[PDB]
Write an enzyme that holds these catalytic residues in place. Structure first.
Site, PDB file in Angstrom:
ATOM      1  N   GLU A 114     -33.112  24.128 -27.962  1.00  0.00           N
ATOM      2  CA  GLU A 114     -32.577  24.196 -26.618  1.00  0.00           C
ATOM      3  C   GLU A 114     -31.891  22.865 -26.327  1.00  0.00           C
ATOM      4  OE1 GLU A 114     -35.693  23.271 -27.263  1.00  0.00           O
ATOM      5  OE2 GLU A 114     -35.847  21.411 -26.126  1.00  0.00           O
TER       6      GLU A 114
ATOM      7  N   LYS B 118     -33.415  10.691 -29.848  1.00  0.00           N
ATOM      8  CA  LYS B 118     -33.718  12.059 -30.241  1.00  0.00           C
ATOM      9  C   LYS B 118     -33.617  12.300 -31.754  1.00  0.00           C
ATOM     10  CE  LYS B 118     -32.504  14.649 -26.052  1.00  0.00           C
ATOM     11  NZ  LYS B 118     -32.270  13.515 -25.109  1.00  0.00           N
TER      12      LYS B 118
ATOM     13  N   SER C  76     -33.224   4.034 -24.550  1.00  0.00           N
ATOM     14  CA  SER C  76     -33.274   5.294 -25.275  1.00  0.00           C
ATOM     15  C   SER C  76     -31.924   5.779 -25.783  1.00  0.00           C
ATOM     16  CB  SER C  76     -34.008   6.323 -24.416  1.00  0.00           C
ATOM     17  OG  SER C  76     -33.361   6.521 -23.171  1.00  0.00           O
TER      18      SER C  76
END
Ligand SMILES: O=P(O)(O)OCCCc1c[nH]c2ccccc12
Ligand SMILES: O=P(O)(O)OCCCc1c[nH]c2ccccc12
Ligand SMILES: *Cc1c(COP(=O)(O)O)cnc(C)c1O
Ligand SMILES: *Cc1c(COP(=O)(O)O)cnc(C)c1O
Ligand code: NA
Ligand code: NA
Lengths: 390, 265, 390, 265
Positions: free
Chosen positions: A108, A86, A376
Site C-alpha cells: 500500500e 523506508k 527520515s
C-alpha cells in the site's frame, strides 16, 4: 498460537479475517527463522551496505544551535537510496518473501514513498510488484506513480471509501486474502497485524544502532533524547529500539498537529485519538464517536496513517516514550531553517521531528542537551508544496 | 432465545436447507431497506444476515463496498441500524437475525454494551469479520452472557485444531467459507470433508457463504451436508441495478429469493 | 609565473584579462598550501564523511549483465548529499575561499545542480552566495532555482548572448573581474583557467580512490575500464585520476551525441569540435567556422558545457583515455534499463556513461570485462523530461 | 608603418592628448557603422579603437554587450569587419586604427594569418582582451612579424614586474585601465605612479580606458601624464539611444566627440 508476543501491553494483536491467519503465522515463522540465519543476515547486510548506502551519516548542526546549550545531530536517512528510511525494511521484507518462496509483492502507499521503495526492492530482487494507492493520492502524486512504473511495478488506484491510504490498506488486505499463497504483503509501517510491527522494527533498528555507535564515537556518551516523527511509527521505532533499555535516553515521538489539535484537523491519534480495532490491530485511532475510521490531516502527505503502531502506544502508556505534536506551520519553519542554515532540504515528515527539537532548544536555551533528530527523508519531493504555500 | 435451533429443527423436519440473504442495513435508504427486508422475508428467506455500514469493510468485494457507500450517502449510522433491527424484530418474531460486523463497531464503545444492545433489539447472532478465533475471547464471552450466538468462519481449508475451536466457540450456525478472497458474486467457490469434521465435533449447523448466486449452488451446498447457504452480493446487485425503480427492485428481489429458496427443498 | 603547470600538453592555460591574473595566482598559491595542510585535509575529509555521506557505495549490477561475461559496478555518486558528485568539490572550494579570507561566492550553473551545490556549501560554511544562470535555463529549471533560494543564495538571470551556460560563465567572470578581493569564483567543472582544472580534479579524486579500494576488495583486481560522462569533465576526471598510472585500466569518457554527431546537434567538442580559446582556456570547442562559440545540445541539460576540460583533451591526444559519444535515445534506453532492472533512477547525464557500458557488453557479450560506470547523479530531476518524451 | 608614433609626436608638438573613441564594427549595421566612424573622425577623433563582434565578450559590460548583439542581428562577421577596415583605411590614411579582439577570433584560423590580415587592411594595433602577458608570446611575436603593435593592458594596480613586462612587450600605446571590472560608462575609475613607472621603463604612450565619459575625465587623464583617453560605452550609448533616428545619432556623436576632443587641449 504464535512464536512471539503479538501484543505490546493492550495494543497490537492479529485482527484479520480467519482466512489470513495462516499467512501471518507463516510470515512470523519465516521471520524467526531468518533472524537466526547467518546467510539471511549477511545478504540483508550486503544489500544495506552496497545497494542502499548504509551506514548513513550522523551530521552535527552547529549553525542551527549557535548561542544555545543544545548540541543537535541529524541521523541522515535522507541519504539512503530512495531518499527515505523506508528502503531499509522493504529490502528485508523482499528477502523474507523470497525465503518463503513467494514471487509477488503487494504494497500500500499514501504519498508514494513506500510504493517507490517496494518497487525498487522488487525490481532489484526479481519480484513482481503491485501497489495499491488511494485515487486521491494517485492524482496528487504523479511523480511517485511514474517512478513506480519506471521500476516495473503495477500501480492500482483505489476508489473505495475516502480513496486515500486507509482505503489502500484495506484493498491490499482484500487482495492478500485471495492471493497469499503466491504473494507477500509488504506492509509499509510498524503497524498492522502481528507480526508486522515487530518485523518492521527489527528491519529498521539499524537506524538506532548506528546512531548509538556514532554518537558514542563523537560525543563519548548517549543522547539526552532521540526525536522522530510518527506517521505509522517505523522510522521512530527504528531509531528508538536500540535505546529502549538505556533509561537515561528520552524517546520523543512527534505526531502531526496539522492545523492545530483543537481544530480536529490533525494526525495525532496516539495522544488525541481513541483506542479502536482496525487494520488488524488494537491501537489509538482517528475515529468518529460512532466508530467510523477517519483520515489523518497534515501538510505532510506521508504522516497520513490514521492510527499508530502498537509499540508506540505501549511505550507511551508505561512512560518510556513521550509523544508530542507539531503543527503545519512549525514544520514549515523547521524546513526553511534547515535549508537555510545547514544546506539540507528535509522531508516535511522529518521536519516535524526537527521542529520539536528546535522548540526544545529555543524554549530553554541555556539547558545543556544533546539531541538526535532522525532525518527520515529528503525534501526535494516537498519543494513544490512549500513553494506554493510561501 | 433459541431462534437458530428452532429454525434448523423445522428445516430438518422438512428436509430443507436454509436460504439466508445478506443485505447492508440502510442501503439504499432506511425506508427502502426496511421494505427490501420485508420482501426478502415474504419471498422465503429463512434467516437474515445484516451488515452495519462501516467505513473500512476489508472482507467485502466491490458490490458490498458500494452498498456501504450507498448507506453512508443516506446518513445511516449504527444507532439507526439498531432502531431498524428493533422494528424488524417487532414485525417478525421468529426469523433468526444475524449481524455481520467489523470489530471496531463492536469494540468502540464497549464489547459488553454492544452485545447487550443486540439482545435488547432481538438479534440472534453476530459474526465479527475481522476477529479470528485467536482474538475472539472477549467477544464470544460477551455474546454468550447476552444470549447472542457468536459466529465463526471456517476457511475452505481449515486444519483440525481450527475445526475443533470453531466447533467449540461458535453457536447458532457455523459460517463455512466457499473460498478465499472477499465477498463477491462474480467469484464462485469440495467442502464435504470440512462439513463432516464439523458434524463430528458437534459444531453448529453450517451455512456456506461467498459467491452463492444461483439456485444450483444452494442445492449443491445442501447436498454436500451444509444446513443452508447465504447469498449477499447477488442480492445487493439487484438493489444496485434498480435504484431508479424501487418497485422493480422489490419484484426482482422477490423473484430471486423465491428461486433460491425453492432450490433448498 | 605559476607554482604548477597550467597546461596539459597544448591544452589549458590562463586566458583571462590581465585584471584577473592576481586572483588566479592567489587561488593557486592557497590551493598548494591547503594541499599540504593537515588541518585543511582533515576539515575537508570530515565534511565529506559526516555531511556529504562519503564513502559512496560501489554497487554490482548482476541483473543488467545476466547472460554475458560483463561484470558491471556503479560508483554511487547519486547517493552523495545533493544527489550528484558536484558536492565534493564545492565543499573543498568553499574551504579554500575561507582559507583566503573571502566571504562571498560566485558560481555559474546551467541545469542548476552546480548552483544548488554551491548554495548548500555556502549555507553550511557561512558564505554569501550569488549564482549566475542563463535566463533560458532559469525558465526551465524552476525547481533548482527554488532550492538555491531556500538555501539563501541569490540567483541572477543572465540575458546576454544565448542566455545559457556559456553566458552565465561569462557573467561570473565579469563579476569576478570587479569583485575578486572579496569573492571567490566557485567554478563548476574541471575546465576554465588554471588552476581550476587542477583544483577540481583534486577535489573530485576521491571518486576514483574509493572505487579502486572498493573494486580491489570485491574483485581482487582493477577494472578493465572505468566509464564516465563528460560535460565539462569533473566527474570523469575525478573517477579517472587515481587510475591514470594503472596503464591496464581503460579510461572511457562519454560525450553527449545529442540527435547524432552527423546532425551537428550534439555536445561532443572533444572528438567533434575544433581547438579554440574561450572561458580562460585553450581546448576543443563547439564553434562556428568563423570562431563564434556555440551551445552544446543534449537531452541532458547538465551535459551543456560547450567545451571540455583541458586534461581530457590531453589524455585523449596521448591515447591514455578514449572518448566516445552516446545519443539521446541511447541515454534514454539506459535510463529505463537501470530503473527497471536495478531500481536505481540515474541522472540523464550519467545515463550516457551507462549506455556506453551497455554497448560494450551487448556488442561482445562473451568478452570477459570488469567495468565501472561512474553514476554521477540521481535522476529524480529527469522524471518529467523522460515522462514527456515517452 | 608608424601611425601611433607619428600621431603622438604631432600631439606632443601641440601639447594635446589623444581622444580615441571605441565602437563595435557593424553596430548597428555595416553602412551606418561606416557613417558613424567617418563622423567620429570628422568630429576630432585622433585614433580609433574598433571591436569585432564576438559571441562571448567577457571583458565588456552591458552597453558593449548590446552593441555586439546589434551587430550580430545585422549579420556582421569578422570577414565583413575586415572589408570595413580596408574601406576605412582607404578613406583615412594616417589615423591609427586599433582592434579590440577576443582571443578565439585571433587564434581560430591561425594567429599568424590574423596578424597578416590586419597588416593587409592597414590596421595598426591589436589588443586581445583575454590574453594576459603570461600567454602573449605567440600573439606578440606574430604581431611584430606583421608590423602590428600588440597592445597590453596595465591594471590599476599592476606591480613592478608586470609594468616592466607591459613596457617591454607592448608597442604603439599602452592601455591603462582606470579600474577593475568591465567596460561601462556608469562606473568611473590616482594613476600617476603607474604612469611614471611606465615612462621610466620606456613603455609606449599610455591611453587610459574604462569609464571615460566626460570632458573633465579626458583633461584629468592627460594632466596625470597619460597621452590620451579611450571612450567606448559613452559613445555606444549614443548609438543605442538614437537607433530610430540615424541623423540625430550622427549629430549627437559629433557633439560628444567634439567636446571630448576639445578637453584634450
Ligand atoms: O454472497 P457474497 O459472496 O456476497 O457473500 C456474502 C456473505 C455474507 C457477508 C457479507 N459480508 C461479509 C464479510 C465477511 C464474511 C461474510 C460476509
Ligand atoms: O569606455 P568604456 O568603459 O566602455 O571602455 C572602453 C575601452 C575599450 C574597450 C572596449 N571593450 C574592451 C574590452 C577590454 C578592454 C578594453 C575595451
Ligand atoms: C513514510 C515516511 C514517514 C512516516 O512513516 P513512519 O512509518 O511513521 O516512519 C516519515 N518520514 C519519511 C521521510 C517517510 O517517507
Ligand atoms: C553537472 C553534472 C555532470 C556534468 O559535469 P561534469 O563536470 O562533466 O562532471 C554530470 N553528471 C551529473 C549528475 C551532473 O550533475
Ligand atoms: Na498516525
Ligand atoms: Na562539453
Amino acid at each position: 498460537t504464535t512464536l512471539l508476543n503479538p501484543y505490546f501491553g493492550e495494543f497490537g494483536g492479529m485482527y484479520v479475517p480467519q482466512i489470513l491467519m495462516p499467512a501471518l503465522n507463516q510470515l512470523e515463522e519465516a521471520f524467526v527463522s531468518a533472524q537466526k540465519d547467518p546467510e539471511f543476515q549477511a545478504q540483508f547486510a550486503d544489500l544495506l551496505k552496497n545497494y542502499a548506502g548504509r551506514p548513513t551519516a550522523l551530521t552535527k548542526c552547529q549553525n542551527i544551535t549557535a548561542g544555545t546549550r543544545t548540541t543537535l545531530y541529524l541521523k541522515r536517512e535522507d541519504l539512503l537510496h530512495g531518499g527515505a528510511h523506508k528502503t531499509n525494511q522493504v529490502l528485508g521484507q523482499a528477502l523474507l518473501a523470497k525465503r518463503m518462496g513467494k514471487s509477488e509483492i503487494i504494497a500500500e502507499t499514501g504519498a508514494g514513498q513506500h510504493g517507490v521503495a517496494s518497487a525498487l526492492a522488487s525490481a532489484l530482487l526479481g519480484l513482481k510488484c503491485r501497489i495499491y494507492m488511494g485515487a486521491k493520492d494517485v492524482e496528487r502524486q504523479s511523480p511517485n506513480v511514474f517512478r513506480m512504473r519506471l521500476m516495473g511495478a503495477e500501480v492500482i488506484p483505489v476508489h473505495s471509501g475516502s480513496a486515500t491510504l486507509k482505503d489502500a490498506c484495506n484493498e491490499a488486505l482484500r487482495d492478500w486474502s485471495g492471493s497469499y499463497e503466491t504473494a507477500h504483503y509488504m506492509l509499509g509501517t510498524a503497524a498492522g497485524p502481528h507480526p508486522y510491527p515487530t518485523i518492521v522494527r527489527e528491519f529498521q533498528r539499524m537506524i538506532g544502532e548506528e546512531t548509538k555507535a556514532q554518537i558514542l564515537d563523537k560525543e563519548g556518551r548517549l543522547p539526552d533524547a532521540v526525536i522522530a516523527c510518527v506517521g505509522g511509527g517505523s522510522n521512530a521505532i527504528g531509531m528508538f529500539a536500540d535505546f529502549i533499555n538505556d533509561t537515561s535516553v528520552g524517546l520523543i515521538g512527534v505526531e502531526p498537529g496539522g492545523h492545530g489539535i483543537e481544530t480536529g484537523e490533525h494526525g495525532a491519534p496516539l495522544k488525541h485519538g481513541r483506542v479502536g480495532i482496525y487494520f488488524g490491530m488494537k491501537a489509538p485511532m482517528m475515529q468518529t464517536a460512532d466508530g467510523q475510521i477517519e483520515e489523518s490531516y497534515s501538510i505532510s502527505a506521508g504522516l497520513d496513517f490514521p492510527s499508530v503502531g502498537p509499540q508506540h502506544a505501549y511505550l507511551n502508556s508505561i512512560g518510556r516514550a513521550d509523544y508530542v505534536s507539531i503543527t503545519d506551520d512549525e514544520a514549515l519553519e523547521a524546513f526553511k531553517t534547515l535549508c537555510r542554515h545547514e544546506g539540507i532540504i528535509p522531508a516535511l515528515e522529518s521536519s516535524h521531528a526537527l521542529a520539536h527539537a528546535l522548540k526544545m532548544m529555543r524554549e530553554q536555551p541555556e539547558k545543556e542537551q544533546l539531541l538526535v533528530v532522525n532525518l527520515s527523508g529528503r525534501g526535494d519531493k516537498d519543494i513544490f508544496t512549500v513553494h506554493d504555500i510561501l | 432465545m433459541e431462534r437458530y435451533e428452532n429454525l434448523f429443527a423445522q428445516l430438518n423436519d422438512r428436509r430443507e436447507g436454509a436460504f439466508v440473504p445478506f443485505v447492508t442495513l440502510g442501503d439504499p435508504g432506511i425506508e427502502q431497506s426496511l421494505k427490501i427486508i420485508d420482501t426478502l422475508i415474504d419471498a422465503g428467506a429463512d434467516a437474515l444476515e445484516l451488515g452495519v455500514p462501516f467505513s473500512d469493510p476489508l472482507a467485502d468485494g466491490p458490490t458490498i463496498q458500494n452498498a456501504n457507500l450507498r448507506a453512508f450517502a443516506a446518513g445511516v449510522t449504527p444507532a439507526q441500524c439498531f432502531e431498524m433491527l428493533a422494528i424488524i424484530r417487532e414485525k417478525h418474531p421468529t426469523i433468526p437475525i444475524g449481524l455481520l460486523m467489523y470489530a471496531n463497531l463492536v469494540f468502540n464503545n464497549g464489547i459488553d454494551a454492544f452485545y447487550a444492545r443486540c439482545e435488547q433489539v432481538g438479534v440472534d447472532s453476530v459474526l465479527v469479520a475481522d476477529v479470528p478465533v485467536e482474538e475472539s475471547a472477549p467477544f464470544r464471552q460477551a455474546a454468550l452472557r447476552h444470549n447472542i450466538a457468536p459466529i465463526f468462519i471456517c476457511p475452505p481449508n481449515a486444519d483440525d485444531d481450527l475445526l475443533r475451536q470453531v466447533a467449540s466457540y461458535g453457536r447458532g450456525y457455523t459460517y463455512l467459507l466457499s473460498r478465499s478472497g472477499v465477498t463477491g458474486a462474480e467469484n464462485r467457490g469440495p467442502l464435504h470433508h470440512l462439513i463432516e469434521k464439523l458434524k463430528e465435533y458437534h459444531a453448529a449447523p453450517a451455512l456456506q457463504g461467498f459467491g452463492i448466486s444461483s439456485p444450483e449452488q444452494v442445492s449443491a451446498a445442501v447436498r454436500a451436508g451444509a444446513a443452508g447457504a447465504i447469498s449477499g452480493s447477488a442480492i445487493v446487485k439487484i438493489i444496485e441495478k434498480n435504484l431508479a425503480s424501487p418497485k422493480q427492485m422489490l419484484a426482482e428481489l422477490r423473484s430471486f429469493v423465491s428461486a433460491m429458496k425453492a432450490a433448498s427443498r
